[PDB]
Amino acid sequence: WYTVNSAYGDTIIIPCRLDVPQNLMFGKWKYEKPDGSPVFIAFRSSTKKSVQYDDVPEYKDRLNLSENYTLSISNARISDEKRFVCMLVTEDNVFEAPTIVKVFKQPSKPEIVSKALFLETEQLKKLGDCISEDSYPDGNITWYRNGKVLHPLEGAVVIIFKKEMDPVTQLYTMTSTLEYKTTKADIQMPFTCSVTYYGPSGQKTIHSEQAVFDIYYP
Ligand SMILES: *[C@@H]1O[C@H](CO)[C@@H](O)[C@H](O)[C@H]1NC(C)=O
Ligand SMILES: *[C@@H]1O[C@H](CO)[C@@H](O)[C@H](O)[C@H]1NC(C)=O
DSSP: OOEEEEETTSOEEEOOOSOOOTTEEEEEEEEEOTTOOEEEEEEEETTTOOEEEOOOGGGTTTEEEOTTOOEEESSOOGGGOSEEEEEEEETTEEEEEEEEEEEEBOOOOOEEESOOSEEEBTSOEEEEEEEEEEEBSOOEEEEEETTEEOOOBTTTEEEEEEEEEOTTTOOEEEEEEEEEOBOGGGTTOOEEEEEEEEETTEEEEEEOOOBOOEEEOO
């Protein structure tokens, strides 16, 4: 299970992962549908040096099959997250090698929006919505009070999370609503949020700017 990690919008470089055989006739690249059905996308003849791309609109003007059978896909999309197979064909044999492609799109810097004009003591109020957009894969939202993680607590800290996918791009938008019961200790205290996600270089976290609220009490 060899994997190629690519950032959204970059060129995906997929080497064949096969030794060049003696008596090579041609090579072909294909991708597998979710249930394993094959779709051929590129062809290269070793004898004629010709290059042909199958009529697959999803890959129109996006492929380049080099002389050593490396397939390059331009402008990485979420639909490119598939298993690709390099097939080398000789006069009496077929050799196949798969490569898993994973695509990553960095979530937007989170922002606290739809903010309360003021928080009320002994009353649960919607502090705001922490939104992080156009991400792939989805991310986890954490809330903080004075730079310290704010965990849920019955009748005091209620966190309502949702992840929505755009059906055309397959990118995620994460929204975390914080319903909060303030105290006078929150006078001039900053509230922030962050998004934790997996990218090509591993697990990363991006923090938001702070939000300070006027605390009202009877
Ligand atoms: C040879 O393969 C490498 C990847 O292993 C690729 O970067 C290079 O462009 C290829 N060269 C040719 C001439 O196909
Ligand atoms: C998000 O949280 C879940 C647990 O709820 C965890 O399994 C997952 O690895 C977390 N994702 C990231 C990007 O850390």
